[PDB]
Amino acid sequence: QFTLRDMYEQFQNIMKMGPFSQILGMIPGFGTDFMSKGNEQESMARLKKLMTIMDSMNDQELDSTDGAKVFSKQPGRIQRVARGSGVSTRDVQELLTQYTKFAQMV
Amino acid sequence: QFTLRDMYEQFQNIMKMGPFSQILGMIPGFGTDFMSKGNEQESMARLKKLMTIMDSMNDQELDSTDGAKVFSKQPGRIQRVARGSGVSTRDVQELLTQYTKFAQMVKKM
What we know:
Chain A: One of its GO terms (biological process) is SRP-dependent cotranslational protein targeting to membrane, signal sequence recognition. The structure is a homodimer. By secondary structure, chain A is mainly alpha-helical.
């Protein structure tokens, strides 16, 4: 059941994530038309892959004020995330680069 | 300030409103290029205006299983909503039609 209040709420959530989604599109490797009309599905697959990678990080890396510097101080962490998430270290490094870029804009 | 955990959460939020944002792009009445590249500022100003129209509605109309129906049986209500939101009668019927198309696909989701 989809009410008018339900539609009101979805509109709030969509507006809220607007600034955020706009920043992401500015960052390399995300897609020029990230989360725009027609590109909603592909953009979600993207994020899902990045989330599965982040699922192999520990609390120290996730909660650190600057999660990039934790990995450069102990590069072994990069290969660990990659093995846990079943992805390549290139992918883990690519995400870390995007995170730094993002963090700097916020 | 901004951790990797914060990025995950924001990705989770986008994962949620994702499909709905898709549905919103499949409904007419939003002009040309609705939510595309450089049309994100105009597109959001539209949602906000629709929100101001629903701000003129009441709880009965808002929580109704079919809010469009509540206005079909009591067209007097349409006139009030339009008065309070500084919009025209047609604008409210438009919102109602859009809501109809939105709700259709949500159950088709």
